[PDB]
Coordinates of C-alpha atoms in Angstrom, one line a residue:
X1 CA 49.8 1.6 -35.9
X2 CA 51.0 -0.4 -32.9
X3 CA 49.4 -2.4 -29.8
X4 CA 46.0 -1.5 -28.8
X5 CA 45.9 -3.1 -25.4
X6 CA 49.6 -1.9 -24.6
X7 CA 50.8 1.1 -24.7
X8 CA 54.7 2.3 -25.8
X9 CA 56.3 5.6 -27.2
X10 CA 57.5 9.1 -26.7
X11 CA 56.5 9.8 -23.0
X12 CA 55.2 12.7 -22.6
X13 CA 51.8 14.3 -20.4
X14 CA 49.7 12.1 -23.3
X15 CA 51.8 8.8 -22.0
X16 CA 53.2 9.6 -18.8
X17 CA 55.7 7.4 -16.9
X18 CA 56.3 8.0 -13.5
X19 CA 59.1 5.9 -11.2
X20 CA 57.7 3.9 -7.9
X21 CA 59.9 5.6 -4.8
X22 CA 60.9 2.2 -3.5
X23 CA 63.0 0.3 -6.3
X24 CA 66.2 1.5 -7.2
X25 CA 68.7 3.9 -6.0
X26 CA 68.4 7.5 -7.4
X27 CA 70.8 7.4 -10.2
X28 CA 70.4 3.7 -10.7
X29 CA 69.9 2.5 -14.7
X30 CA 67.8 0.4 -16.7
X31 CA 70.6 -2.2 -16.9
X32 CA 70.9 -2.1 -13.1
X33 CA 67.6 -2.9 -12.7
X34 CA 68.0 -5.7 -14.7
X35 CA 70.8 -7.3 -13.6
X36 CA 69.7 -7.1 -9.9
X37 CA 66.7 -8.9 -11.3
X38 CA 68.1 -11.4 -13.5
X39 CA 70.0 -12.3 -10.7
X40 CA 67.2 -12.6 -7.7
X41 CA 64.8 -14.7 -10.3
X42 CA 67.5 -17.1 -10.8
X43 CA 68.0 -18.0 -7.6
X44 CA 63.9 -17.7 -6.9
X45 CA 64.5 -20.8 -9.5
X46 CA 67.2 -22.3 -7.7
X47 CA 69.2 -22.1 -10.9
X48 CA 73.1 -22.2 -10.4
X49 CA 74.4 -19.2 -9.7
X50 CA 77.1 -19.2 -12.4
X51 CA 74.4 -19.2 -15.1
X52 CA 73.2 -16.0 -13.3
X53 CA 76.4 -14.9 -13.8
X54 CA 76.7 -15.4 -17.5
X55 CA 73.5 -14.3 -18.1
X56 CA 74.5 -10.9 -16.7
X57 CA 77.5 -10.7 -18.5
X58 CA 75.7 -11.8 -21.4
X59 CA 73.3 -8.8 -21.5
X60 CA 75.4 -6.2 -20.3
X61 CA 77.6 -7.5 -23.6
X62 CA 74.3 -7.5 -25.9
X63 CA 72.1 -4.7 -24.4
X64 CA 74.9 -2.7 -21.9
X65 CA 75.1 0.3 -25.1
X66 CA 71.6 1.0 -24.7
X67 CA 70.3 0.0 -21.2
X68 CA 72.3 1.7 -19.2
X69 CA 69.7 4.6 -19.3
X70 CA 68.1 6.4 -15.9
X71 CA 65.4 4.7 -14.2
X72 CA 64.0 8.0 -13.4
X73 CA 62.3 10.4 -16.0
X74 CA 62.6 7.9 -18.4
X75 CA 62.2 9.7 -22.1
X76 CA 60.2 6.0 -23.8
X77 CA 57.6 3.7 -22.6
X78 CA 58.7 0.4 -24.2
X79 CA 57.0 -2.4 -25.6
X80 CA 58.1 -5.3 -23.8
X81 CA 57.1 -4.9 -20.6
X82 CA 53.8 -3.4 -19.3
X83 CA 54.9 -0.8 -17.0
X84 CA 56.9 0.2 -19.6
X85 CA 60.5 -1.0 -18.5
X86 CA 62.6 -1.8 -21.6
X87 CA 63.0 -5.1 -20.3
X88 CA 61.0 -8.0 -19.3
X89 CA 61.6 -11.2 -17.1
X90 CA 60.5 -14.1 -18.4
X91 CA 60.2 -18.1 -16.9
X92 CA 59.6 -21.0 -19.4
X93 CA 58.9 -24.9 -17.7
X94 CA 59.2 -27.6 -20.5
X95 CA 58.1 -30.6 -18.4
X96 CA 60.0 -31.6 -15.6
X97 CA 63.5 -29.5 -14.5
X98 CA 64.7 -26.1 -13.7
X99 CA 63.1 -23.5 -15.3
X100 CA 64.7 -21.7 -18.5
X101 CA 65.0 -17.6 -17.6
X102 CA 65.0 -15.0 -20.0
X103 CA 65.2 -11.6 -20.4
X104 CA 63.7 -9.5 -23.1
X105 CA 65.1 -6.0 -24.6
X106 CA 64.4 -3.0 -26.1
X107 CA 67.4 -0.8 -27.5
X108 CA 67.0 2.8 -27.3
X109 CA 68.3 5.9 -28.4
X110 CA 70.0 9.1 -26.6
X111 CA 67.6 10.7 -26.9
X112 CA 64.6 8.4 -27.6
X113 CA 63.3 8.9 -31.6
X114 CA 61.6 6.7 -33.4
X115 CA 63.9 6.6 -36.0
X116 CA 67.0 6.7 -33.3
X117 CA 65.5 3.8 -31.7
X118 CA 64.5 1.6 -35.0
X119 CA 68.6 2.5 -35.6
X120 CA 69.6 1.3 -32.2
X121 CA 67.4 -1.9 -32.3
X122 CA 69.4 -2.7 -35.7
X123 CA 72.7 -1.8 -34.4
X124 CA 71.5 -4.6 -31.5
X125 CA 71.6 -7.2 -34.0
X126 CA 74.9 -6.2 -36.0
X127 CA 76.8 -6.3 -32.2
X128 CA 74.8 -9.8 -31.9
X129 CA 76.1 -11.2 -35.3
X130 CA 79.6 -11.4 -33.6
X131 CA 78.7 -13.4 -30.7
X132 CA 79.4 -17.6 -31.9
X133 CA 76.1 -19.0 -31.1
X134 CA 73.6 -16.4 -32.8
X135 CA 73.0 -17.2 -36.3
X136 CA 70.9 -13.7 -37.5
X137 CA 71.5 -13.6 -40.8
X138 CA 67.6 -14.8 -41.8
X139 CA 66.8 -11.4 -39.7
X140 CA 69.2 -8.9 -41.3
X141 CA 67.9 -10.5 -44.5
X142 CA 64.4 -9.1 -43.1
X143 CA 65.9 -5.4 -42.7
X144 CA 64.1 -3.4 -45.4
X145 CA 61.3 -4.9 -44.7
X146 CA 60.9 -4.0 -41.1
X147 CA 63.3 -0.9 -40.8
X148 CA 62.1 1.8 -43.6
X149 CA 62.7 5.8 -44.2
X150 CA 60.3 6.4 -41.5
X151 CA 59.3 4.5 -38.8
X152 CA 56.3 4.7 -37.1
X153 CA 55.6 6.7 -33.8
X154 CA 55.2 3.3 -31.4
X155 CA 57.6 1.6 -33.7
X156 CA 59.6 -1.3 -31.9
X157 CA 61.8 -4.4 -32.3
X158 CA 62.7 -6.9 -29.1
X159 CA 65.4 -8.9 -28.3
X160 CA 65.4 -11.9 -26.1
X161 CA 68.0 -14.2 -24.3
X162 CA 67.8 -17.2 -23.0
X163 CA 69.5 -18.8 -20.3
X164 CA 69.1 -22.4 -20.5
X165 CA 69.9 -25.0 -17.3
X166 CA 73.2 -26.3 -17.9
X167 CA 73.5 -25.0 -22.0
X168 CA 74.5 -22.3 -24.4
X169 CA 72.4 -19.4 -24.5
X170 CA 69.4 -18.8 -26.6
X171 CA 68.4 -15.2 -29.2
X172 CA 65.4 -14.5 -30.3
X173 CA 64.0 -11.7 -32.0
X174 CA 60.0 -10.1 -32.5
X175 CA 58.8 -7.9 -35.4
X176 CA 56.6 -5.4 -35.3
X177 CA 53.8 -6.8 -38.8
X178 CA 53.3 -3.0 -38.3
X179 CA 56.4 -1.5 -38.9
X180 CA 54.8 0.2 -42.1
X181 CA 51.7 0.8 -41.3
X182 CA 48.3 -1.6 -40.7
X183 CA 47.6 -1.4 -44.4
X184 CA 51.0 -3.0 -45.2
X185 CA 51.1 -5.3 -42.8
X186 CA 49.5 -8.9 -44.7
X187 CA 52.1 -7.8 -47.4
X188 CA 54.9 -7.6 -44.9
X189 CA 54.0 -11.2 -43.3
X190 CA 53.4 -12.1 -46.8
X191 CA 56.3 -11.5 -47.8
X192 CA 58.7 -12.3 -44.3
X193 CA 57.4 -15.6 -44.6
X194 CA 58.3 -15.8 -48.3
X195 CA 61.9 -14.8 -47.7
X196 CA 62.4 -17.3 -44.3
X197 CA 61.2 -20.1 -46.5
X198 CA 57.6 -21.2 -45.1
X199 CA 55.2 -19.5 -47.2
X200 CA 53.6 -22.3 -48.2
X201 CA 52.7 -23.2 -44.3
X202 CA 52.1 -19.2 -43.5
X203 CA 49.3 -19.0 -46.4
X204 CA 47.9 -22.8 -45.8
X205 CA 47.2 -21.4 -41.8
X206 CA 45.8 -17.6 -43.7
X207 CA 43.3 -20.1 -45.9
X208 CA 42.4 -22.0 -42.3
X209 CA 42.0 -18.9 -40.3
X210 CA 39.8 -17.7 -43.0
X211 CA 37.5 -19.9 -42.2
X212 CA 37.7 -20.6 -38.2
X213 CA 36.6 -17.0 -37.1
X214 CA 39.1 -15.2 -38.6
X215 CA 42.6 -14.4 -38.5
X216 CA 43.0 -11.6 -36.1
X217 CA 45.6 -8.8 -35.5
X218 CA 48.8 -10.1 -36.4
X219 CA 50.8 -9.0 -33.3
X220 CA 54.2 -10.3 -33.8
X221 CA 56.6 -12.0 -36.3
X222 CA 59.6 -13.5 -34.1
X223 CA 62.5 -15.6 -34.9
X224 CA 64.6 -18.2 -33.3
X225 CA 68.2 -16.5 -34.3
X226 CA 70.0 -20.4 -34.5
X227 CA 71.3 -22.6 -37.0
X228 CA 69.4 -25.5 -35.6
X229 CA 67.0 -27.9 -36.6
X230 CA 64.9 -26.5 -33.3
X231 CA 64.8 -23.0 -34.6
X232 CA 61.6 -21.5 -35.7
X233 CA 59.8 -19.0 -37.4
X234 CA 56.6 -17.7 -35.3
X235 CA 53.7 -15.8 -35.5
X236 CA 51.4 -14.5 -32.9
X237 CA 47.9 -14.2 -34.0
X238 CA 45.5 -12.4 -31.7
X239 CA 42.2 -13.2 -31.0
X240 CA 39.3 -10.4 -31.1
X241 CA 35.9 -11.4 -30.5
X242 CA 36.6 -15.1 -30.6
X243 CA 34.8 -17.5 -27.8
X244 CA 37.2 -20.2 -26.2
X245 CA 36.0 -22.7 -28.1
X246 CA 36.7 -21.5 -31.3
X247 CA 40.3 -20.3 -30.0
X248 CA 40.7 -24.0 -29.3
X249 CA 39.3 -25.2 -32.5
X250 CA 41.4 -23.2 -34.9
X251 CA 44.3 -24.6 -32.8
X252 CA 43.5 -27.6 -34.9
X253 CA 45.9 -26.5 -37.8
X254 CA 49.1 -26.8 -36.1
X255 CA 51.0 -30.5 -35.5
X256 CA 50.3 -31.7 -32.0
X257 CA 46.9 -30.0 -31.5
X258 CA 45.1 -31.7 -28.2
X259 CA 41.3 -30.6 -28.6
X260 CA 40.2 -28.9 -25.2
X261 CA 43.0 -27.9 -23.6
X262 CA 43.3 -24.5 -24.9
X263 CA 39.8 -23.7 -24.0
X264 CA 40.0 -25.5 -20.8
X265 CA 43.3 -23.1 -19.9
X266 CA 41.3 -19.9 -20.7
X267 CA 38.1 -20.9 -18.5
X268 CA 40.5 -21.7 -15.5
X269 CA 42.2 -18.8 -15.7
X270 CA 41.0 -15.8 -18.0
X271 CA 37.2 -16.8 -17.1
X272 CA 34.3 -16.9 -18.6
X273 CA 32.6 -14.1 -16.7
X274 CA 34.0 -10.5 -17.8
X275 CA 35.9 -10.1 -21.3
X276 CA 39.8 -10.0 -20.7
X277 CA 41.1 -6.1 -21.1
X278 CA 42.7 -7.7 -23.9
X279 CA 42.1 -10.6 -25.6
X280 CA 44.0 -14.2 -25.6
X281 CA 46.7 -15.3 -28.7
X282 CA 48.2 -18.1 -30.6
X283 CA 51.7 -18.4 -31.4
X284 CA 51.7 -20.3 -34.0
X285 CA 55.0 -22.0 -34.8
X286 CA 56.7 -23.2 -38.0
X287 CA 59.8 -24.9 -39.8
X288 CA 61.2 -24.3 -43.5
X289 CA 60.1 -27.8 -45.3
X290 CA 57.3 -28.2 -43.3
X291 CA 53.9 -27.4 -44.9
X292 CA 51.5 -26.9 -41.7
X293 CA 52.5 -25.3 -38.5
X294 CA 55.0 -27.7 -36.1
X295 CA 53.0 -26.2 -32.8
X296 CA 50.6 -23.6 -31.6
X297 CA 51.3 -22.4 -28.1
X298 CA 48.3 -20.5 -26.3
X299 CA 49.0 -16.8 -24.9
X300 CA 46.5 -16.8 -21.4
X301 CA 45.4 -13.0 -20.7
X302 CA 45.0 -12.6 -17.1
X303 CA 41.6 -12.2 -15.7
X304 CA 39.1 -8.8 -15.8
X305 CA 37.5 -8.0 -12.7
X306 CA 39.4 -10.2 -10.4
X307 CA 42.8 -9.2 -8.3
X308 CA 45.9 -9.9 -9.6
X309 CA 46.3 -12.1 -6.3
X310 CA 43.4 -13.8 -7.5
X311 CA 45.0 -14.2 -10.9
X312 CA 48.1 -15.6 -9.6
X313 CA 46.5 -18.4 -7.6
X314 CA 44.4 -19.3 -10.3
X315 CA 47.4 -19.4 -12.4
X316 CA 49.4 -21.2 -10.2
X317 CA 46.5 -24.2 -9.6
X318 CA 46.8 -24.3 -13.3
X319 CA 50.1 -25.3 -13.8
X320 CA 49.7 -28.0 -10.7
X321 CA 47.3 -29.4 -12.5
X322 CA 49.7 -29.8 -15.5
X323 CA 52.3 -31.3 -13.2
X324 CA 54.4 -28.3 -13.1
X325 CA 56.0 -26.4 -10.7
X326 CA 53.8 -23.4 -9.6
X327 CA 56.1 -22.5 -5.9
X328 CA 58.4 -21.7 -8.6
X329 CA 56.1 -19.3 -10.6
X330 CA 55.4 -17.7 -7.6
X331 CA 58.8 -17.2 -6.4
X332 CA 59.9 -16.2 -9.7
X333 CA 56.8 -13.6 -9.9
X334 CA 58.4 -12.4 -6.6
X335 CA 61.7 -11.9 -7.4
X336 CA 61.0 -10.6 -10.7
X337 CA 58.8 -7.3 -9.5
X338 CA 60.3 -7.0 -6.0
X339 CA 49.7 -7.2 -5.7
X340 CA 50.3 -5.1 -8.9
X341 CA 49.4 -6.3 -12.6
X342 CA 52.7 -6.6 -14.1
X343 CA 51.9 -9.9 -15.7
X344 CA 51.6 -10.1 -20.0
X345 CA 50.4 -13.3 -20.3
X346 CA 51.0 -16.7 -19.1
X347 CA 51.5 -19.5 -22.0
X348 CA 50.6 -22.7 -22.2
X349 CA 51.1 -25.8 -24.9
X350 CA 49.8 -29.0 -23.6
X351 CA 51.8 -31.7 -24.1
X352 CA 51.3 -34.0 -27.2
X353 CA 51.6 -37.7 -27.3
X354 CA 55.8 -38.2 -26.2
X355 CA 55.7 -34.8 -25.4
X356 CA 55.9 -33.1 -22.0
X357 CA 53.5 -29.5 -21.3
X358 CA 55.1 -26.2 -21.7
X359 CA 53.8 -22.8 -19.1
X360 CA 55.6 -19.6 -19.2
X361 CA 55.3 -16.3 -17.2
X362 CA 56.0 -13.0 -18.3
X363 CA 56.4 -10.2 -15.9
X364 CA 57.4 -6.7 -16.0
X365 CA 59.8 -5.6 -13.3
X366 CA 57.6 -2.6 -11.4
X367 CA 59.7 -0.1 -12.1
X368 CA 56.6 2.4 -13.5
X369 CA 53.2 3.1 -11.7
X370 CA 50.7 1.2 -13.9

């Protein structure tokens, strides 16, 4: 049935979408927007500007078909961002080092269907099965799974690329547990997990979730699209009605679990004042012949009844406090939207003995009144 906390669909006068005057050029497209911005938050990162340059060649290669569609009067609110763009900016910080950029995608269809955009977010992945360092055969094994006769009205699939500091690009994709229907949903993962080779792990964490205060929504099923030993399988759990403590605690299921610091992260920033408009998640990570989860990364809503300025510095001290580098998330939240909410979520994974702590931002480029 789709996201609760954020919307996506047909636009229409029941999910309007209206353009902020002072962006982009009238005339200007999706993919402009994009670009402009992929380039700015690279330098906000004080990446090389050659990587910027690939990176845009890279998605107008990938993503050019379908995002080169009007800013103005758009005909979809996407997923992937919350103003609704069709893409979304996103900086990762593993330890130490310049930060890793990527963008996130939605195809869509001329005009925008449900069906015509389930087709086009397909055809995405065929055009990426020709580029040398994507390996997406585990997804198009996936297809009749995710893709049936009809899709539903807020269906969606998203596509991510990763520009990495001095290496070869990164694909991900995220599936929509929903794609037919909530009821079928545990039978999807089920079965997903069955044909990437980690049911054993993906039932072991249902059994534990069962009995840490439940497993809620299942938002997301993404994959790592490489034939690496680093590529995973990942689910994002979210978390109704949970406290922080016990967001922490069933935390304890995944490798490299450090008691505290999830529910530390989630006072500092979400509070523990007002409930956040929507609540926090786990990713939940995992790796054919591995029986339990490798890693569980923490998705940080921003929080209720505060400013987003407010949010931001609170955000920021966080990551100082982790010994990583918050000028840059600010600068990169900057750059990225050009005061307004356009955050998702911040992550976070502490680090692990030998390990260094992860923090990402994800921020929607402005381009729609909230």
């Amino acid at each position: 049935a789709g996201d609760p906390f954020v919307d996506n669909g047909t636009v229409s006068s029941q999910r309007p979408l209206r353009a902020v005057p002072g962006r982009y050029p009238p005339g200007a497209t999706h993919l402009d927007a994009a670009v402009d911005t992929l380039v700015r938050c690279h330098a906000a990162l004080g990446r090389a500007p050659s990587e910027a340059e690939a990176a845009v060649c890279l998605l107008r290669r990938l993503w050019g078909r379908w995002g080169n569609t009007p800013v103005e009067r758009p005909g979809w609110r996407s997923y992937v961002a919350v103003d609704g763009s069709p893409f979304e900016l996103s900086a990762a910080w593993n330890g130490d080092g310049p930060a890793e950029v990527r963008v996130t995608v939605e195809a869509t269809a001329d005009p925008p269907t449900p069906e015509g955009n389930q087709e086009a977010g397909w055809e995405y992945l065929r055009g990426l099965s020709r580029h040398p360092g994507a390996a997406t055969a585990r997804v198009l094994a996936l297809e009749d799974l995710f893709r049936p006769q009809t899709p539903h009205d807020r269906c969606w699939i998203m596509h991510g690329m990763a520009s990495r500091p001095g290496a070869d690009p990164l694909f991900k994709v995220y599936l929509d547990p929903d794609a037919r229907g909530a009821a079928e949903a545990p039978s999807v993962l089920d079965e997903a997990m069955d044909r990437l080779g980690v049911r054993a792990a993906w039932q072991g964490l249902r059994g534990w979730l069962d009995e840490h205060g439940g497993s809620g929504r299942i938002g997301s099923l993404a994959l790592d699209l490489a034939d690496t030993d680093d590529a995973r399988v990942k689910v994002y759990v979210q978390h109704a009605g949970l406290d922080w403590a016990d967001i922490d605690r069933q935390a304890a299921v995944a490798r490299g679990h450090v008691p505290g610091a999830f529910s530390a992260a989630l006072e500092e920033i979400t509070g523990t004042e007002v409930p956040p408009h929507k609540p926090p998640v786990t990713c939940f990570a995992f790796h054919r012949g591995v029986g339990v989860p490798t890693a569980a990364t923490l998705y940080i809503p921003m929080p209720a009844g505060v400013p987003e300025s407010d949010a931001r510095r609170r955000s920021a001290a966080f990551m100082r406090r982790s010994g990583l580098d918050s000028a840059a998330y600010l600068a990169f939240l900057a750059a990225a939207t050009g005061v307004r909410a356009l955050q998702n979520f911040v992550a976070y994974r502490p680090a692990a003995p030998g390990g260094r702590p992860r923090f990402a931002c994800y921020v929607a480029p402005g381009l729609y009144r909230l």
